[model samples]
Target: DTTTILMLPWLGYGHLSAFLELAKSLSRRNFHIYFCSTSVNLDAIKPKLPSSFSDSIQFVELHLPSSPEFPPHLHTTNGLPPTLMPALHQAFSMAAQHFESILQTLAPHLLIYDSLQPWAPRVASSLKIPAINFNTTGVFVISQGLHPIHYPHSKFPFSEFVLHNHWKSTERTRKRGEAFLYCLHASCSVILINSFRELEGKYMDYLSVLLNKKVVPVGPLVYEPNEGYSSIKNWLDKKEPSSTVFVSFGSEYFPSKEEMEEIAHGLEASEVNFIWVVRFPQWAPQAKILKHWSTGGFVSHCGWNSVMESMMFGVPIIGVPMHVDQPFNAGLVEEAGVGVEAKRDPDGKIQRDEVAKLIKEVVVEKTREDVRKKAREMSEILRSKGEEKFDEMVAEISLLLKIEHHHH
Candidate 1:
């Protein structure tokens, strides 16, 4: 008695990575997963997936009619495309139509969909199958996702309180229809966000109210390549509880070269011993900048995966958010007291001196114990799920079909 499930992703790395994680988790629960992707991205994530799971997960390629071999409008390989909404609509329609025979035959019980697919909910509605919106983005960002007005105004360097209190237009982004973001609000029966309870309880509460549906934050779904990094783990093992900083920007959100240099200089001056994952070419500062630093502090770009990994290790962060969702993710880290934002000039330059000062103030010294405590609290929350709630969630969903069909 197999429960058929279909999973679809927009052609981006982070979204696919999160999608794959969800797929793997579902596969473990015995769902037959059909992973949908474009040919290009399929090749990209093929290696990163757990090899054993390949047999259980099937890849479906929705061919484009006359488009370039790769997406021409998109310049970056990491994050979502600027033209995501229409592109997703076109793709989903094509996948639904092109793969019609398979869908009719398989009759998937569920569509585990990413937030980017605006057409998925309609497709699910038409087919009368259950659809779940996977918020691969963090809860902090999804909090803002529910409130579209604040999307443009509360860009960065703004406090969470300000966004909640003073911002009026933040809730209006969904109305614009430029990106079809509102589709997400209406598109699903259940929403699964990538977040842990400890990190973003407040936002999660707000999202539940706004969506008027059940919302589950299943997070700290961190995937780390620790094979050759025994030393890194060992170093983390020896650190005074919650004393280190983990820094990373996502596949998207590359800072400009100047910004990266400023950050590298700032980290060196702050003197924190940090582990920062570098991915953006635009932000690839001279390696020597961080390579020469002595501090234990980190400067991060606030990617969702990076944030979860940092939480897993109980390391504090010095956040430098790069894009829309990232600023709020930084807020989660800072609000939790595990990190602080590096100083940003009015012109939006992160000044080296200010970042250095915050680094020493928040990361190197004993002044930010509150931050450390929050970091540990977050860590416990992530590791505490045990099997109870997750298992319960599985059971609740399973009753709609069968007792043995549990989709984790």
Candidate 2:
């Protein structure tokens, strides 16, 4: 059967990119993909998509409902100020009607949505379609958030979970969690997280047991097209193997002036050949950067995409977790033996000395040779399992389609 899947990711490049990779994978199997997002986000993706899958992969734009405080420009998370995030979410919620109308028109066979949009599952429910949450983040963050609500009796208490500005003590945040739980309970029967058993298998198991649903680990759905280049590759070409550090903070987050200055000095002090791809008001090819032979280590914001890239490329990491679920991801980097988390102050400031030390420790010094070895080993493991992972994900989706079709 031809299963038509509607993918609705949150308003961020991280979320959109993860979903797009999955959509492309499915499209290769001849599945119809309705990749829905706002106009700006769609414009960014349309240019890069392969022409071969044009017939199967379709782009659908959802015009974001505008408010006085949240204009059309402020609707997206790209280059968006953190303070206005709440307003952005509010604006997104206001577009529920717009989404509902689109879904009614499309009526896809299955809906795979971002975790942030709890309402998406609800809309799928209203249309009597199957919906599953696609978590762009890792299992640790999802388990941490819901463990307290699901396993209150465990020794670990919810209060101990470090709170973020987006999710705080306010009634609003509480309600958001509650709504997410509601969607989990009432709408979705399975959850797809973008991680593998090797990295976060235990956390994936815990989430399944906690929710009593099929928590499928889709592995790292990394988009590594062997194309595109610039002078950066030339610079890397001149350097020796495993000698250069690639510094980037994914798509959304940008370093503060203080942070940038410290990093500049730290790299200078370490005397390491580096390519710092700061896309605050710019764009750079990341997967290619990590894949380069000269790239030895990564200084990253610990976003899931960056972690997956590093793992695939066999590069060590210097994790400087900024906010959201980055801290948890950074912890995973250290735990997985592929990287070292930089020491930060009580206020979560990355000191220049720590950055310098970590860079040297990962790339220059032979003292942390184990970290490099493990990184290469994990990379082999990841590369070997590409076929198996894709097959597993396809089977999971096929099962969902069959079950839903049978019920209908």
Candidate 3:
């Protein structure tokens, strides 16, 4: 039977990218999708996507009808804030209402929404239709998102999580971080994560307990990315296994010019063959990724997709979480023993030379040997888990839908 799926995303490039991947996966499962977005994103990605792929999925791009009612600068923010919550709620509610009107004419069986946008639960709640939350990140992160423990209004806020090192010193100090986790956990029937059990078994178990909900750890969904690391391949093609460092900051985060320069100097000093992806600003044209592969280890912002991409190509990671979930994601990489952390400046910025020192500790000829051993061990784990992760995710979602809909 054909399943009609509705899709909605928060207005961020990274979130949209994850949604695009999800839509592609759903289409492969014989599901027809109704994708919603603002005109801003349509203009940006319309050029990059293929016409057939673009057309196969329905696009509902909305434009702001009024300047004051939907102010131009209102949606833009450097970091997240709860102040925008009401407006965000209103926007998605409007979109959901619009979707409902359309659904009457062309009913969709299910809705798969980005947990970052909390509008789906309401629509599904009102319609008595099932909605599954597609956490492009993971349930571990979402479990963190659910507690009222990290918002500005909470007793222990995001700032407290940053300041409190409870997780490091003692169990008593353990506290959750971020409102994203809570916001995500509140609005869904199913919590779908982009994670693999083999890679994060212990935490995944802990997360299930925390959320008291079903957790799906099917991920590392890498299909030999087409933008194969040709240069990284050339370097890895000849080097000993697990000898190179793969540095990447995912598609988000902005580092100051000094921070960028500091990292460059650090990698140069470390004297390693590394591949790094610098996150470019929105105003800039496409970043030149090939030119930055001369260093030894990857100093990354700890994004999961970037983590998988690096692992697939056999590169070690240096986890410097610029902000938000990057810290937690990087913690996983470090736990995997895949890389080291870059030094943060006094003002809590990543310093270049400190990053250089860590790079040398892990990638230089003398120190590189030991870190390389750890990297190889972590790499094998990620590779094995990566192999089975995607299939598990597909089956889990299929099973859940069949059970919910009471259909084959």
In TM-score terms, which candidate is top? 2
RMSD of each: 6.5, 3.4, 7.1
Candidate 3's residue-wise lDDT over 1-408, tens digit each? 566777776666666666776677676666787776666665554554456675457776543233675553344222324455456445645665666665455567666766654445666756756677666674445444454432446552222223223223231232332222343322343466666665666656766665555667656554332345554456656666434565555444666687677777877886766655454543222122212333345666777666665555455677766666777666556655666655466665556667777766765554655555666666577666533455655676677666756532
Off by over 4 Å in 1: 65-76, 79-102, 145-160, 163-187, 224-247, 272-296, 399-408
- On lDDT, the candidate that comes out on top is 2
lDDT of 3: 0.57
> Which lDDT values do the candidates have, in the order given?
0.62, 0.79, 0.57
**Candidate 2 residue lDDT tens string, 1-408:** 566889998989888888898888888888899999988788777766888888999998887877676667666888887787777777788789999998999888888899777588778888898887888878877677676575678854322334333312263565446435644332376778899888878888877877777787776988876434777778788888878887887666777899888778779887787777576642788888888888888988889889988898888988877767788788778878888888664455567877887788778765688898889999998998866777766777777777766666
Better of 1 and 2 by TM-score: 2
Task: Tell me the RMSD of model 2 versus the true structure.
Answer: 3.4
Off by over 4 Å in 2: 67-74, 150-187, 406-408
TM-score for candidate 1, please give it: 0.75
